[model samples]
Target: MHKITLIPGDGIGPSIVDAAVKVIEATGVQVQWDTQSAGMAAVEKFGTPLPDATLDSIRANRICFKGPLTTPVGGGYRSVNVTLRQALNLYANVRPAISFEGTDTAFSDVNLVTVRENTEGLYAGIEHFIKVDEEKIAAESIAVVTRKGSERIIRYAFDYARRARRKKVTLVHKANILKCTSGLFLEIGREIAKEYPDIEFDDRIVDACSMQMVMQPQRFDVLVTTNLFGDILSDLAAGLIGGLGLTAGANIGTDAALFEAVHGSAPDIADKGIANPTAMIMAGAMMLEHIGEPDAARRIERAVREVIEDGRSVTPDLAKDSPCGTAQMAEAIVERVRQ
Candidate 1:
């Protein structure tokens, strides 16, 4: 049995998390889920979006499965998700964009993974306003990219590519302009590529990479970049497939790992039972794989792919012709998993 912290976030988060939990449970992998609350629900109940109890649960478990967390706009509070990633020092944000036949997308065969540097970059929250004569003149945002941070994230990408048997690892950066920060990242990526000679490696400017990602997505396999670039490009990769609803995100560090759906918490559709739980379910499969349950993970993945492809009992997002709710869709996947 594996002990994992589970955060059923705000809005439709709980419903989607419940659906994924059912699917995971059907896999017969014993998971002792330490359920905790966060986001608006937590703020309403515990007076803080992120409670120490939630963080303590994650820290104690070293593994977390979470749903989309709502970050109240203009609250002076950093995103709950971002806080967890930074707090845990999760250095690698891995998101795989694989197209499914049932989802409406530009491409059907697109398959690529984005490995983002999670801990440092502009996201380090080191920005401040420069005041001159009691008036704010300019703001400065510092991008801290250390040799150690660059080395670990880049090496993680290569190691991931090699382990996944990916054909190539593309280092996306703006080294042509942002010399120091992206330059160090690219430099470290090259050094790590040398360590994994079996895996082909290449480099691309972030702008050109974006164009190539949409124009010729299948040409790429694994993409690695700094924090900001990865955050942007991974969503672009998701757009290439279907949308955020089908993409699963994973944040990994030496001590802890967190897997979550890449999409936002749909507050409008809260409790409507119409939320698509594919991303959360896929994240569960990822969590299982992280915990050394590859067989169970593969079973969940196969079932999800089959259910989505069949499009018979899928949610309205996947199949408008069907009247399937979140629980119904999950039950459909669970039914497939048992077989």
Candidate 2:
């Protein structure tokens, strides 16, 4: 049995997680899911968004399949998504933005993957008050760019391209102004590109990269950037195809791998059953591929695409004429797989 940690998350998380679990089980692969909770649900049940039990479960298996989590507004609590990535040493955040034929997107040939440095840069949680007097007003947050983190993440992008047979790997940065921080990252990217001589490498300013992504998404194959840039660009790339609802994310470490829906928890349509489960189901497909079940993974991927191709069987969001709910859409994918 393939044992994996399953975090169902909050809001629409449980419904979609159930959809993913059922679809994964339909593929004839036996999985033992250690179903855990996180986000608001965990806070209500365990007095913390991320309890020791939840983290421990993931640590034991080292592979997690998660749903979208609800991050509390303001600075009350830390993001469970960020917390998991850092705590588990998942340094490479891989998010693939591939276009489907029938999806409502201008571009139908976008196939870009954003490889983000998951654990460093502005998200290092290094912020403190620079108090001038008794009244605390000013604060400083450090954007740590370590050579070690930069090198590995860039190398990871090259290797991913080489493995996936992608033509080019682009390094996105803001080295023009943030010289020391982004310059070190750009330098390491250049250094790593030398080692991967077989793979093509290039760099671009973050702003220019964003503009290029809008104009020519097909021009980018694999993009690697720091934490902040990666987080932003991945969402932008997702828009190239459809939206976050149609994309998935992966946080990879040496020992562990975590896959999740890149979208946020939709509290508005939490129980209405209109929330699309495509991203979470795709994340399950990614987890299957990561766990050495490529055949099953491809089946799941193809199943989703086929369902979308049919269009009549998709949810109301994807097809207004269709009255399919979240469960129905998932069942359509499952039925397609069984066929």
Candidate 3:
């Protein structure tokens, strides 16, 4: 039995997580869930957003299924997501956004996966404060891209491409301006491209990639990039089909992995129950795949599609006439899964 840690984070985290847990249990997979608290609740109880115990649990188990966590706005609190990624050496962040039938969005059929470098770049959280003439000047951040880090993510991208039967891999970079870091990333990507001869490899400037994605998204297959670039591209990719409400993300490393919905916890509608659980449910499906339960994953995914295709029990974000709330839509999918 695989021990999977569960972090039901702040706001609607608990609600969506409950729906996902129900679906996972219905699959009858022998997963031992070690639950822990993080985010606002952890700050209130443990005096820290990410307690030592939560870290230890994930370290011990090596796999987690997490809900959306709220990072306090004013920067007093470090992000639990970032802290876990850095501490666990989770170097690759993968987000897959696909179009469901009933969802009202731009494209008809869109499927794209974004592979982001998890540990470093502008997200490295390096900053400085300088004093000059009775004034304080604060230096915000910097992107640190090591050759080893770039190579590892690029290699992982190629490996994923091969496994997923993807035909091409596009390296999105800002090499034109930020010469040293982004250039080095592109260089490493090209070097790794040499290893995968059968797969088509290409490069695109970050800005151009954004334009191209909106103009002709179908032309691209797999997009691999640095932290900031990948962050932007993933959301843009999500918009091409639908929105983050149906996006699923995975944070993976050699030792530990976590699956999560890419959307944030909507505190405004937390108790109202109008929030969409499709992202979280799809994330649970990804969790199933990660734990070697492909059949359960397939069933959950198919059920989600069926519910969407039936054009009923949809969330407001997906449909105007969605009379169902978050839990109700989730229940609809679950009922289909049970069938």
Candidate 4:
């Protein structure tokens, strides 16, 4: 039995998490889930968004499944998700986007994996306020990219490509302009590529990579980049196949791992029962893969595809003709899996 921590998060998190829990239970996997609170709800309960108890729970479990968290805009509070990633030293943010049949997508044959550096770079969240003359400056945020961080992420990318049997890995950077930081990333990527001779490795400018992604998404197999670039590019990649509502992300490190939905908490539709649960459901599938339950993961994946491919009992985003609500769509997939 594998012990896993569960963070139901905020907004529609509980609803979608309920669906994932039901499906996972149906699989008969011996998983012990330790539930905890975080984000806005946790702030109300524990006086802080991310409580020490949550961190302790994760450390004890070694793995976690999280739902979308609500982060206040322009507030002094940093993102709870960011805090957890930095605290755990989760260096790789893996997001896989692919097209499914009977689904409305910009690209018909889109399939790509994004490997993002979870720590360092601009997302390091280093900033301050400064006083200049009579006026106040918002201060500057640093984009720190060290050789050690770069090498770890690059090596992780190469290792992922080899394990996933991906033919190529593309490193996106802006070495021409931001030479010190981006250049270090590209340098480390080159060094890492030397070890994986069988896999084709290449480098592309971040700006150009964005343009090429829309024009020729199939040309990419696995894209690896710094925090900021990966944040933007992953959304662009998701646009090609579907939307963030259908995307799943995984934060992985040497010791701990977490799988989560790439979408934000829909506060407006919290209790409407109309929120799409595909991302969280799929995130559960990714969690299965992380725990070496590939068969169970594939079972969930196939059931999701079957629901969409059948074009019946799907959520609004997936169902083009007759769309179902959140729980309805979840039930449809669960039925498919059971059958």
Q: Enumerate clash totals for all models, in the order shown.
A: 0, 0, 0, 0
Question: Native-vs-model 2 lDDT?
Answer: 0.90
- Runs in model 3 lying further than 4 Å from the true structure: none
Q: Against the hidden true structure, what lDDT does model 3 obtain?
A: 0.88
Q: Looking at model 4, which ten-residue stretch has the lowest summed lDDT?
A: 314-323
Q: Following a full C-alpha superposition, what root-mean-square deviation does model 4 have from the true structure?
A: 1.5
Q: After superposition, how far is residue 83 of candidate 2 from its true place, in Å?
A: 1.4
lDDT per residue for candidate 1 within 81-146, as digits (tens), equals 888999999999999998887777778999899999998898887888899888988888899899
Per-residue lDDT for 92-208 in model 3, tens only?
999987777766766776777899999999989886667797687754567899999999999999999999999899999999899999999999999889999989999999998
Candidate 3 weakest ten by summed lDDT: 133-142
lDDT of each: 0.90, 0.90, 0.88, 0.88
After the best TM-score superposition of candidate 1, give how far the Cα of residue 297 lies from its true spot, in angstroms.
1.0
Name the regions of candidate 2 deviating beyond 4 angstroms.
130-136, 321-323
Q: In candidate 2, how many Å is residue 325 off?
A: 1.8
lDDT tens string, model 2, 129-238?
A: 87878787888889999989998899899999999999799999999999999999999899888888888889999999999999999899999999999999999988
Best candidate, lDDT-wise?
A: 2
List the lowest-lDDT window of 10 residues for candidate 1.
70-79
lDDT of 4 at 170: 98
lDDT of each residue in 205-285, candidate 4, tens digit only:
999999999999999999999999999999998778777767899999999999998888888878888777888888999
